[PDB]
Write a protein that binds this ligand. Sequence first.
Ligand SMILES: Nc1ncnc2c1ncn2[C@@H]1O[C@H](CO)[C@@H](OP(=O)(O)O)[C@H]1O
Length: 174
Amino acid sequence: EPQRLFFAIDLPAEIREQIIHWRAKHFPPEAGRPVAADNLHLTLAFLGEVSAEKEKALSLLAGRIRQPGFTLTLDDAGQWLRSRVVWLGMRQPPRGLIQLANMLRSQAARSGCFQSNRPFHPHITLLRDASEAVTIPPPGFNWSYAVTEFTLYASSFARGRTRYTPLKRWALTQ
Ligand SMILES: Nc1ncnc2c1ncn2[C@@H]1O[C@H](CO)[C@@H](OP(=O)(O)O)[C@H]1O
């Protein structure tokens, strides 16, 4: 059956907990719709609706990826008014993050995946449906962790929440 899929990098439990606390402190409920703590992630490549045959092809392509791990330090926060999101990010993302995304984006495009032809802006979405031009505080201190793997996720909606289901993970070769 066709599953809406995407590749993502996840955050350690402690940092996610620090983020939702920082968010609740600086952003009122009317600033946007809050992303659940377990849904905090950094999307590497969106694939759109993809079937089992093509999912299997894309997984194989992901398995041939050979790339060392890298460190993410979240020193940047902002707001995209047109896309209507409040985001967390990195001013100077490591080349590894850029390399990994580009490797995965070019693999989906050569498999026949829906294309946006938009630049890759590594970010972690905190608020959705943000309309008003609120004010963005700097992120918390020392939101920095080592990236050890990336995951292929399935997107679904179950009883009033958005749910991401992990399917497969690939480690980065250190
Ligand atoms: N049709 C589409 N085209 C481009 N990007 C899309 C999309 N549908 C969803 N997205 C985006 O891919 C991520 C899915 O976890 C989300 O990004 P973020 O979670 O905000 O980083 C969607 O906004």
